[PDB]
Amino acid sequence: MSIENLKSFDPFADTGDDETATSNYIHIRIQQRNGRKTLTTVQGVPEEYDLKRILKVLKKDFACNGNIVKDPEMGEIIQLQGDQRAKVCEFMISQLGLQKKNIKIHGF
């Protein structure tokens, strides 16, 4: 037998936030010719996900050609072809870890 030693409480504490610089966490530029061929570019991919990992998973998922390009603004614009825009955004954020601190959208 014991003397009031059941259901012991324990600490929990909390984490520590920290902001470096807000302006754009994920770039997204769409381009079309008012026809059928749909194209969408994206940038800001982390190191954990290379162009080969995104091109292999995208092409294997729903055949989403995810190649890379070099623009005069940076030189790493990941070009993604396919009518799965909302998908690339849902998969990018869901895979990035709920990243929405900022988004650089292009204006055509």
Count helices and strands in the chain by DSSP H and E runs: 2, 5
Q: How many residues does the chain have?
A: 108
In the chain, alpha helices (H): 51-62, 85-96
CATH assignment of the domain containing 63: 3.30.780.10
Measured over the CA atoms of residue 23, residue 28, residue 33 and residue 35, the dihedral's sign is negative
What are the structure tokens assigned to 59, written together?
Answer: 């092409």
72 vs 35: CA distance, rounded Å: 27
Domain count, the chain: 1
85: burial class by Cβ within 10 Å (0-12, 13-18, 19+)? middle
DSSP 3-state of 74: coil
Buried b (16+ CB within 10 A) or exposed e, 31-53: eeeeeeeebbbbbbbeeeeeeee
Asked whether residue 7 is assigned to any structural domain, the reply reads no
Amino acid letter for position 12: F
